Design a protein around this motif. Structure first.
Motif, short mmCIF file in Angstrom:
data_model
loop_
_atom_site.label_atom_id
_atom_site.label_comp_id
_atom_site.label_asym_id
_atom_site.label_seq_id
_atom_site.Cartn_x
_atom_site.Cartn_y
_atom_site.Cartn_z
N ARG A 1 -10.35 9.20 7.93
CA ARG A 1 -11.28 9.15 6.82
C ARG A 1 -11.51 7.69 6.48
O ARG A 1 -10.57 6.96 6.18
CB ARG A 1 -10.74 9.91 5.62
CG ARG A 1 -11.74 9.98 4.51
CD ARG A 1 -11.25 10.88 3.42
NE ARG A 1 -12.25 11.00 2.38
CZ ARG A 1 -13.23 11.88 2.42
NH1 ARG A 1 -13.32 12.71 3.44
NH2 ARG A 1 -14.11 11.94 1.44
N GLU A 2 -12.76 7.26 6.55
CA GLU A 2 -13.07 5.85 6.42
C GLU A 2 -13.00 5.44 4.96
O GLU A 2 -13.35 6.21 4.07
CB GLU A 2 -14.44 5.57 7.02
CG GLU A 2 -14.78 4.12 7.15
CD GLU A 2 -16.01 3.91 8.00
OE1 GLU A 2 -16.58 4.92 8.46
OE2 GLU A 2 -16.40 2.75 8.21
N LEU B 1 -16.54 2.99 18.25
CA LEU B 1 -17.27 2.23 17.25
C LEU B 1 -16.29 1.48 16.36
O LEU B 1 -15.12 1.88 16.26
CB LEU B 1 -18.12 3.17 16.39
CG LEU B 1 -19.22 3.85 17.17
CD1 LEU B 1 -19.86 4.85 16.30
CD2 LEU B 1 -20.22 2.82 17.64
N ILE C 1 -15.84 10.39 20.85
CA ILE C 1 -17.21 9.91 20.79
C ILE C 1 -17.69 9.83 19.37
O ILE C 1 -18.56 9.00 19.04
CB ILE C 1 -18.08 10.84 21.65
CG1 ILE C 1 -17.37 11.08 22.98
CG2 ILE C 1 -19.42 10.21 21.94
CD1 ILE C 1 -17.99 12.10 23.87
N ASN C 2 -17.12 10.64 18.49
CA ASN C 2 -17.28 10.40 17.06
C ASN C 2 -16.54 9.13 16.64
O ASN C 2 -17.04 8.38 15.80
CB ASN C 2 -16.76 11.61 16.27
CG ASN C 2 -17.71 12.80 16.32
OD1 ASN C 2 -18.92 12.65 16.14
ND2 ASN C 2 -17.17 13.99 16.56
N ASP D 1 -16.51 13.27 4.41
CA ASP D 1 -16.81 11.90 4.77
C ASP D 1 -18.25 11.85 5.26
O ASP D 1 -18.84 12.86 5.63
CB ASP D 1 -15.84 11.42 5.85
CG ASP D 1 -15.86 9.92 6.05
OD1 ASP D 1 -16.65 9.23 5.37
OD2 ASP D 1 -15.08 9.42 6.88
N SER D 2 -18.81 10.65 5.31
CA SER D 2 -20.09 10.48 5.97
C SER D 2 -19.90 10.51 7.48
O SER D 2 -18.81 10.77 8.00
CB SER D 2 -20.76 9.21 5.50
OG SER D 2 -22.02 9.08 6.14
N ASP D 3 -21.02 10.34 8.20
CA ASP D 3 -21.11 10.17 9.65
C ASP D 3 -20.78 11.41 10.46
O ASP D 3 -20.96 11.41 11.69
CB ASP D 3 -20.21 9.02 10.15
CG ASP D 3 -20.75 7.65 9.82
OD1 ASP D 3 -21.98 7.46 9.90
OD2 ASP D 3 -19.96 6.77 9.46
N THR D 4 -20.29 12.48 9.84
CA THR D 4 -19.77 13.61 10.59
C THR D 4 -19.88 14.83 9.68
O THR D 4 -20.01 14.71 8.47
CB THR D 4 -18.30 13.40 11.03
OG1 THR D 4 -18.08 12.05 11.45
CG2 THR D 4 -17.96 14.26 12.26
#
Lengths: 48, 48, 48, 144, 48, 48, 299, 48, 48
Positions: free
Chosen positions: C19-20, C12, C7-8, C45-48
């Motif tokens: 790692r984006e 999407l 779900i993380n 990282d961002s988002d998490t």
């Protein structure tokens, strides 16, 4: 929104011809100024 | 590359060549050769 | 890993490196901060 | 050879204050000593109408309100330079060499066109300062 | 108590004619525009 | 030291003198993150 | 008001003030005897109230000036010498940053390979046999007008902006990117910063090694800048506290700071020099009002 | 437990209305001053 | 964007594990200088 319109297009190419000015500079300095003559006559005047 | 031809020589005006700001273009390098100065660079004058 | 949270991650448009690695967030012309963004897990990282 | 095509340039657009529709909100008067004016105020005198009261009820008296609105004041400025090499090529031609003539007339155009750009710059800062003050004054719609 | 003109707010000046984008809202005619044409190419943002 | 370990500050106590006064004068010891995707964030904290 | 007119009036007033500083009205009786050349020179009659920069001519043997005959704008150092024949001798900032210790080994060897000859080797031997550094070699100013004859003529600016003549191509100070650092909480705080030169010594178990630092800060006050530099150099300061007692060499401090002069924040730009193909990263300060203050030591 | 609080900033375009002739501007003619430094001459136009 | 984001107690730790939370000095001072209660609560609360 679509209609035919009567447009005034070109039909032939433009021309660009060297002068003796641009010929001599192309020979001796490997280079060309566009508008060398119009350029020169307005070089020293107020309206540069 | 010489820039003093641009700095000095006769120029032809062009209306609305950039609808958008050229700040972004200069700051994020759209171009291949650009020369920018804020304060007025007096080096336009040493014509050797 | 069989513990990787869906779900993380999988629901999407997302980099499958985990790692984006999108370079629209990195300081441009800085290879050290670039490779720190691509690898370093001292940072997050961002988002998490 | 290595050709060089035409050399183009920008048109820095001009703006008059009374062209833009901010001047219908504005009403602008020159006053050459507002630098010496500390404050400018206006004075308003309101009286209120009175209604006669009912039986065995206290009556309000004559109400007269006096108020005084004040003036903000706010400067704008614009700065631009000319180099000293330019200032040498401004007027004293060293010799009548063609190069000195070219540099003379370019220095002169640099001066005139920078003065122009500065006058435009004062106009647009008049726009920006007036817009600044309107947005400082304006309360939000839900309160209104 | 009578006074006709306020010289600090009313003074003779020259008049011209121009066009404005208008809206009609219950017999109220209101000019209606954007200031983007004066904030096209400047250091500041549009303050709205 | 163990509280810094578990909450992950990882860096030493600032210092007397300049490092404290750089914090009083007011500063960021943290390097900006090499990657960023959504702009700014900050979350304060009440215990309940 | 009119605006355009008043602007032209102010510009004419500035140009006429420049002429008032430049030429002098003559109240000699000015009779018609002279030839027209002397006539026009007596009408103009220049004086040197126009440049307002202070220069000095300098003669130096040209073996020492290897990148500095090409790259105008450098710090220069006066080295007095016990040789009577040449009592002073002039030195490049890079020539002294060779045996400075701050420079990494790659940049140090690269510059040395620029600076390898017999004269420069003998001068470096003299500098090393000198006891301290700061009062056998000293700061001198900023370079303009390299001539490079047999014995090269160097002009050098003590005060004012750096230019030979014509007030065109105003050169800038060229600082090696490795040797400079800006100690402050906010680098480039608001506006024009003051550029200083910091000499710092160090002792690696046998001899003293000097280090040449250049700092840029918004602080004007010298007490403030030595107070930030003690906080920067507190560890090696401690090592010298142990060295300076057991030593007997005549010095009494850790380092010294001296102001070069003003700069501008937007006139800081990076770049690189190259001499004989050696690319060398520099931070080129652009327009510098040179202002030498006194040396202020800190221990 | 805890109440985590957080603020967020948004890019908003936001229009203004004003009644006509709501505020008056009394202003100076732009005054001109001039600083003659050794390498530039800076003209400053001020306007109250 | 629709990224599910999670907050934890292990994430709340750098805001709750600070020494100023487990200090009692300021609470002692302020609750000391806050004045005494009234009589009807004073008999009930302040008697032990």
């Amino acid at each position: 929104y679509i209609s035919t319109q009567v447009v005034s297009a070109p039909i032939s190419y433009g021309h660009f011809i060297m002068g003796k000015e641009n010929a001599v500079t192309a020979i001796a300095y490997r280079a060309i100024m566009a508008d060398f003559t119009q350029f020169t006559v307005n070089a020293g005047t107020e309206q540069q | 590359e010489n820039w003093q031809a641009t700095e000095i020589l006769p120029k032809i005006e062009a209306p609305l060549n950039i609808f958008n700001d050229i700040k972004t273009y200069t700051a994020e390098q759209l171009f291949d050769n650009l020369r920018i100065y804020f304060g007025d660079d007096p080096s336009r004058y040493n014509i050797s | 890993t069989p513990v990787t949270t869906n779900i993380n991650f999988f629901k999407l448009p997302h980099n499958p490196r985990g790692r984006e690695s999108c370079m629209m967030g990195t300081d441009p012309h800085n290879e050290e901060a670039a490779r720190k963004a691509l690898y370093d897990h001292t940072q997050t990282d961002s988002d998490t | 050879f290595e050709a060089l095509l035409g050399i183009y340039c920008n048109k820095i657009e001009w703006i008059n204050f009374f062209t833009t529709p901010i001047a219908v909100a504005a009403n602008v008067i020159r006053f050459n000593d507002v630098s010496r004016m500390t404050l400018g105020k206006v004075l308003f005198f309101i009286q209120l109408p009175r209604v006669a009261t009912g039986n065995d009820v206290t009556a309000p008296k004559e109400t007269t309100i006096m108020v005084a609105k004040h003036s903000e004041k706010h400067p704008i400025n614009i700065s631009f330079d000319l180099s000293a090499a330019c200032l040498e090529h401004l007027e004293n031609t060293f010799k009548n060499t063609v190069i000195d003539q070219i540099l003379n007339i370019n220095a002169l155009h640099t001066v005139l066109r920078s003065l122009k750009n500065s006058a435009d710059s004062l106009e647009r800062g008049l726009i920006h300062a007036f817009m600044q003050t309107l947005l400082r004054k304006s309360p939000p719609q839900f309160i209104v | 108590d009578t006074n006709n003109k306020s010289e600090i707010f009313d003074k003779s000046r020259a008049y011209a004619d121009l066009k404005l984008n208008t809206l009609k809202l219950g017999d109220k005619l209101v000019a209606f525009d954007h200031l983007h044409k004066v904030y096209k190419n400047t250091d500041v943002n549009d303050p709205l | 030291t163990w509280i810094r370990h578990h909450v992950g500050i990882e860096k030493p106590n600032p210092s007397e003198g300049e490092a404290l006064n750089i914090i009083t004068f007011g500063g960021i010891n943290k390097n900006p993150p090499s990657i960023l995707l959504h702009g700014q964030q900050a979350i304060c904290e009440v215990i309940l | 008001m009119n605006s355009k007119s008043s602007a032209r009036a102010a510009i004419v007033d500035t140009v006429e003030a420049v002429k008032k500083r430049k030429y002098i009205s003559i109240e000699a009786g000015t009779l018609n005897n002279v030839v027209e050349k002397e006539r026009k020179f007596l009408k103009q009659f220049l004086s040197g109230r126009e440049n307002l920069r202070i220069a000095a001519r300098v003669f130096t043997p040209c073996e020492l000036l290897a990148p500095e005959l090409e790259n105008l704008g450098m710090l220069m150092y006066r080295f007095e010498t016990d040789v009577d024949n040449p009592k002073i001798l002039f030195v490049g900032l890079f020539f002294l940053c060779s045996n400075a210790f701050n420079v990494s080994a790659c940049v140090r060897t690269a510059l040395t390979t620029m600076y390898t000859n017999s004269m420069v080797d003998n001068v470096l031997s003299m500098i090393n046999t000198c006891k301290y550094l700061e009062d056998k070699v000293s700061l001198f100013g900023v370079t303009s007008l390299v001539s490079c004859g047999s014995s090269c003529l160097l002009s050098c600016v003590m005060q004012g902006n750096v230019y030979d003549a014509n007030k065109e191509n105003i050169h800038g100070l060229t600082v090696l990117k490795e040797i400079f650092l800006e100690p402050d909480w906010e680098p480039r705080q608001h506006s024009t910063q003051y550029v200083y030169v910091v000499h710092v010594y160090k002792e690696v178990l046998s001899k003293l090694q000097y280090g040449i630092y250049v700092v840029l800060t918004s602080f004007q006050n010298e007490d403030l800048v030595v107070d930030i530099l003690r906080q920067y150099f507190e560890k090696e300061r401690f090592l010298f506290l142990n060295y300076l007692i057991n030593s007997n060499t005549t010095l009494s401090y850790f380092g010294s700071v001296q102001r070069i002069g003003r700069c501008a924040t937007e006139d800081i730009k990076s770049g690189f020099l190259q001499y004989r193909g050696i690319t060398l990263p520099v931070i080129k300060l652009e327009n510098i009002f040179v202002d030498l203050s006194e040396k202020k030591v800190f221990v | 437990a805890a109440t985590l609080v957080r603020t967020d900033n948004f890019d908003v375009e936001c229009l203004l209305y004003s009644s006509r002739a709501a505020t008056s501007i009394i202003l100076d003619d732009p005054t001109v001053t001039a600083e003659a430094k050794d390498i530039v001459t800076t003209y400053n136009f001020t306007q109250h | 964007d629709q990224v599910v984001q999670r907050i934890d107690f292990a994430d709340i730790l750098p805001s709750v594990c600070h020494p100023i939370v487990h200090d009692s000095t300021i609470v002692e001072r302020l609750m000391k200088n806050e004045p005494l209660p009234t009589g009807h609560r004073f008999s009930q609360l302040c008697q032990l």
